[PDB]
Amino acid sequence: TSRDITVYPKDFLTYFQRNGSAAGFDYDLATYTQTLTPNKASQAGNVTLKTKVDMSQNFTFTGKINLGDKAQNAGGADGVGFLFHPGDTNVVGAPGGAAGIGGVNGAFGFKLDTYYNGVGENSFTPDPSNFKGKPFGAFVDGLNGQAKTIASSAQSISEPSNNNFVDFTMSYNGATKVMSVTYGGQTWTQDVSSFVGTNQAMSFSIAASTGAFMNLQQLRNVNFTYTVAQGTVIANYVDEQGNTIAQQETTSGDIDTPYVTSQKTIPGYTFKASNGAATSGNYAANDQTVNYVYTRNQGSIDVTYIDQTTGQTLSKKDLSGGTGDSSNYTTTDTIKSYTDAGYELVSDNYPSGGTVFTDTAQHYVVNLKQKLVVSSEQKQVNETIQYVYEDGSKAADDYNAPPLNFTRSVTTNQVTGEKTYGDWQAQNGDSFGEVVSPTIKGETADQLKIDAISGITANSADIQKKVVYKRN
Ligand SMILES: OC[C@H]1O[C@H](O[C@H]2[C@@H](O)[C@H](O)[C@@H](CO)O[C@@H]2O)[C@@H](O)[C@@H](O)[C@@H]1O
Numbered sequence: 001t002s003r004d005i006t007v008y009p010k011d012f013l014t015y016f017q018r019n020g021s022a023a024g025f026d027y028d029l030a031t032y033t034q035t036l037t038p039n040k041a042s043q044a045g046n047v048t049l050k051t052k053v054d055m056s057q058n059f060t061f062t063g064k065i066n067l068g069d070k071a072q073n074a075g076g077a078d079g080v081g082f083l084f085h086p087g088d089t090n091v092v093g094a095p096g097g098a099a100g101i102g103g104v105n106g107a108f109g110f111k112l113d114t115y116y117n118g119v120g121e122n123s124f125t126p127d128p129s130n131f132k133g134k135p136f137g138a139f140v141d142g143l144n145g146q147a148k149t150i151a152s153s154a155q156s157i158s159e160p161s162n163n164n165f166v167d168f169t170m171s172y173n174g175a176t177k178v179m180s181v182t183y184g185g186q187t188w189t190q191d192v193s194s195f196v197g198t199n200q201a202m203s204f205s206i207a208a209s210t211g212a213f214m215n216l217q218q219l220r221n222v223n224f225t226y227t228v229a230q231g232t233v234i235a236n237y238v239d240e241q242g243n244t245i246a247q248q249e250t251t252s253g254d255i256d257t258p259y260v261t262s263q264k265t266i267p268g269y270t271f272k273a274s275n276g277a278a279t280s281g282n283y284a285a286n287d288q289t290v291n292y293v294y295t296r297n298q299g300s301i302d303v304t305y306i307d308q309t310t311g312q313t314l315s316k317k318d319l320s321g322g323t324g325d326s327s328n329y330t331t332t333d334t335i336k337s338y339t340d341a342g343y344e345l346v347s348d349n350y351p352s353g354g355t356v357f358t359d360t361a362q363h364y365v366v367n368l369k370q371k372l373v374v375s376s377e378q379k380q381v382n383e384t385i386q387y388v389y390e391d392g393s394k395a396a397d398d399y400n401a402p403p404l405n406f407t408r409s410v411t412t413n414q415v416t417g418e419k420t421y422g423d424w425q426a427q428n429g430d431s432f433g434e435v436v437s438p439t440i441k442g443e444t445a446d447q448l449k450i451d452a453i454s455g456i457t458a459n460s461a462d463i464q465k466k467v468v469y470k471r472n
């Protein structure tokens with residue numbers, strides 16, 4: 001790769017960032033020395049690596065470490081921790097009995113512990129009992145956040161004395177996944193594959209701390225040859241309420257190397273914004289996340305209710321919902337409403353099996369007409385001639401003349417009330433005939449005939465007449 005580099009003492013600070021105590025002390029380019037903690041109490045200072053490390057590839061770390069001038073008995077603490085973890089390049093471990101390895105998740109390393117911590121805190125498990133008051137060099141399991149010393153790797157080291165620099169070496173094999181540490185003639189080896197696991201990129205921190213006891217702790221002549229791990233970009237395709245709606249898109253590539261992310265076209269959904277990182281840019285050591293946020297596509301359906309008679313809209317219902325969901329609408333209720341007020345349904349193009357919201361808008365029409373009930377009107381004009389004597393007794397049988405019937409058509413508007421009365425039509429005619437009055441022997445009728453009466457109209461009043469017979 002192009003990522004095989006070699007950090008010289010000359011360019012230490014170019015790849016390493018002094019943090020905590022260490023920030024108050026210049027890198028003396030004469031001696032090639034970085035103070036981590038001074039001889040003061042309660043200190044905490046480290047160097048973090050600017051990049052991460054390819055744990056599929058081989059690295060070698062060469063330097064000298066001063067652990068200080070005092071042993072634990074003389075008031076000397078706490079040691080130098082070497083931390084490897086998968087998260088942030090700027091995350092470092094807890095001081096004290098945590099050695100700069102505890103209190104980080106997925107953490108592992110090698111410590112130089114110049115103080116015996118017998119007491120258990122959340123950040124760290126007691127130090128190996130077989131090293132009470134004695135200084136030791138060991139591997140640490142920091143994965144569950146709690147730094148646990150691997151008692152199998154715990155050997156003794158020379159007590160810090162006269163601020164002397166002892167030669168340190170940490171080597172790693174990519175495929176073996178095997179760490180080889182060498183501090184002044186003592187040698188360690190561990191297979192870290194149970195720690196490195198899937199993560200082939202781990203951030204590198206070299207920490208130092210003091211407490212109630214203290215010690216000047218410093219690094220000199222640093223030579224790190226490693227393969228710099230490549231940066232990641234994550235792209236997440238999510239709805240407005242965070243739910244993932246398309247498979248995310250992890251992508252790795254060298255640092256300061258362009259990255260490009262894709263606006264996905266997602267059925268049912270429309271791109272709103274990209275929160276988080278840019279959609280494009282350059283790859284970096286800590287990993288950047290761009291989230292594409294989608295709005296759930298909403299469909300239209302209108303159902304216009306028209307009065308054909310007036311050619312005027314009674315009601316328009318607007319429906320809106322997500323593309324795929326049911327409107328749960330039926331015309332029947334709104335139809336009924338109008339049919340109660342005396343409308344008649346002519347047409348309904350709205351599906352009886354209900355609708356569903358679609359990306360294309362839907363338009364439906366229900367046509368009603370003002371109902372018209374065709375009544376029949378009837379009227380009869382009748383003529384009666386009574387034939388009586390002068391005592392009012394019946395002389396002859398009443399003449400009921402063939403009645404003149406009349407028929408109209410009424411049309412009642414079941415909405416407005418308006419009645420549309422037709423043309424008064426004579427079924428039998430307009431003429432009431434002349435009626436020659438019966439001849440009674442030995443009498444004379446006052447009217448010997450009733451004269452024919454024409455122009456009878458539908459509202460003409462019934463003709464009533466009386467023929468009186470006088471004796472002789
Ligand atoms: O006094 C504050 C101090 O607390 C911590 O140290 C304790 C322990 O973890 C140390 O090993 C010993 C000797 O150094 O002293 C304490 O008992 C650490 O949190 C330290 O950095 C802090 O300043």
Ligand SMILES: [Ca+2]
Nearest residue numbers: 097113115117
């Ligand atoms: Ca300790």
